[PDB]
């Protein structure tokens, strides 16, 4: 049996992420950590085979055989880091997987700017999202409490030419009830907020 | 392993209501139209009515309106039809089909799975349970008459349906009295009859009647 | 390195399936793996050598072969709904001790094709108010009411896939949560600068890969077969 | 309503044989929506209808492919390639793009096989049956064809009438044959003045009458 500590990690941007292993077998003699990412395969990042510090660009795996433990640090946390982090443990050429850590790096917003606004749909304007923008990763997006509305979870844009990165969720629904003003409306945001009006007819 | 279980034969007097249920499993109830159909003895199909359990939406025989009432019972995935006024010539067997349109889809004006039928008698005379006797035994014939019943119908299987081959349930004679009359035969190995034990088993729902008749050489 | 065919696949419950699998680093090891929520990964089995095969944690309901050393294919025997999963397939040298995936294989398995509903995919064009406020215009694109969850979404500008500026959501949400066989939604943004949204040239297009029956399987509904196919919504630049 | 009419209302057809059921509508069948939802059903005896062909020409999968249908307008057909001796029943044809959905007579398929005469047995009543005032004497007729057969009764060789009533079951799926079962019902009274109960069978398999019977009353 391989165990990893409990997850998701939130880990700032430019922090490290803090990732243990403890293994059962005590003759084991090769340690590894796979990065996966959501909806991608297992990818090798790191392996260790003796005590002591082993660093591959942001990566330090430790390892302490007396201790029957691993570790992983990811210095300088970006984003793009996040993903599930699995340790294997074996002993000669099975592979012993952990059930994962996964790892959440929230960007850093020097610049918030939080607005919902009103999108509509290029073939109908009837049609029509909200979205949820430009807020600080100290914001959380609630999940619908309505079934007939449905609101995704903050995602992480990164304008690489700018290097500008931005934080959104969008909400929508056929609910004639429905509004840019209401959408948010379960979730803790910002009390200076932008709402910009959607203009009649 | 889709399955419409519908409820037992009955007799109701003229003028009276019955109410037929159709039990649906195997498959999202919701998602499924499910029609009516009728066929009067030795006679053809016509098609009743249908219900949309999802919305309650119903369609119709003009024939029927004014009779005809179709539910549903989304809880115990069951669709009722009811029909009032009964007249003589309601006596049926009343099915239930599956329209093959999956959730709102077109196909639902063709059916893939029906129920067992209904038989409905529309009659003023009372119900009675038969009375079930052996017909005793390179190869040799025995059987069951199953005698003085009402209404139709009555189920044979022999050796709780392990016994199928050979087997002829022949239709049902009305007798002077009033009373329905059949048999049930089975041709098997005659070098058996001492070693395989042969039980006809008879159901007559309209009256709760269940009969298992031991058949043995005399 | 390792290779997976299929990417994606959809069954009905009693089929038949074998997913293949391939090396060309002339590794002995090869093993299959399925990975569940809640559980990590399970080996279900594995494979020494050409010619040798064992079981592994989970053998149950599958098989597999090795006639040469760079071919393991697992076979499903007959499709149930708790084969509904995720499938990798591993290789080791086995002689260094390192282990190398292959892209993976979801699956699911369905009590019956009907249940299978391809995307539908619109675009909604930058606000107004955006364009003013921030200097940037954000696109977002819904890939709506499609099953199983077998989609792939990519953002196209002039013709040219793009990845800078764009996020798309890691899980799509289940439009009917309480429901198993419940359809899903998936939403994604592009965000680009107003003075490039704003220039009538720049086309837009957010195009969804779905993947669903096969143009053999059998099908008796009035709406179209829903095959593997591309959906896609577009939107043009707008000088507003 | 929209009336659906069949030709031929019977059809009879040797195994290996193609056949083809004619349908005819009084009206036009293709709907708001362009589909046309004319289908074709089997109802084996005993069963409920089955579904052959959907929407004119379209084969429900599990079918076999040795049946198809065409049509356009008014006038619809249902070809089988090569009859098998398991598709005997009645052939319906169905509308459902108005309400009422509406069906065809019906068109009984009969397979034509080679002659083969009945395997007659005798039943006296039983003694269970006795106690209660009344007897029962069956005589079963099995696997015969033709559907053709005589059965006369006789007790000490008198010939009865009146007192016996008959039925035959349908084609066999399997063996294209038919069964008959005869039942003589007597007083337990008058049964019990006899010896010699007999039923004598006369069909084309026969070249001259079968007779089983029984002593005993
Ligand atoms: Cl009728
Ligand atoms: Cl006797
Ligand atoms: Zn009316
Ligand atoms: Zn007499
Ligand atoms: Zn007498």
Redesign the pocket.
Known sequence: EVEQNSGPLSVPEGAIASLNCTYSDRGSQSFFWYRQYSGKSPELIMSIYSNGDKEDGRFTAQLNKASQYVSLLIRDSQPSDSATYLCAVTTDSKLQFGAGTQVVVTPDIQNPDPAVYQLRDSKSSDKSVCLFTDFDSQTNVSQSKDSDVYITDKCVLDMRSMDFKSNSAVAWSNKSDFACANAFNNSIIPEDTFFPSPESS | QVQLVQSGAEVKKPGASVKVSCKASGYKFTGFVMHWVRQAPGQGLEWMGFINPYNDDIQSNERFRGRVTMTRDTSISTAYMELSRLRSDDTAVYYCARGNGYNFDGAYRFFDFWGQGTMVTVSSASTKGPSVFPLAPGTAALGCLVKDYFPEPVTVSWNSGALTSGVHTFPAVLQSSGLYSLSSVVTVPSSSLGTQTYICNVNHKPSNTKVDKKVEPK | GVTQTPKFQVLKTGQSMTLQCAQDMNHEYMSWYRQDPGMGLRLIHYSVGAGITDQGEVPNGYNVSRSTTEDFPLRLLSAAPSQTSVYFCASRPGLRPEQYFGPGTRLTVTEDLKNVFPPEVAVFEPSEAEISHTQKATLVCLATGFYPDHVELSWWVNGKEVHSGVCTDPQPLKEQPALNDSRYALSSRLRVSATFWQDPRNHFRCQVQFYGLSENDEWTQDRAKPVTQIVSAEAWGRAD | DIVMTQSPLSLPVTPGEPASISCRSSQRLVHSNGNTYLHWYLQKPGQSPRLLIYRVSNRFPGVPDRFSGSGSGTDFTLKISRVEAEDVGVYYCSQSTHVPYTFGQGTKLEIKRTVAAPSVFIFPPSDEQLKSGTASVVCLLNNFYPREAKVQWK?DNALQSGNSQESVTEQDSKDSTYSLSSTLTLSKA?YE??KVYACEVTHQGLSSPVTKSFNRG
């Open positions: 007790v008058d003045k006899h």
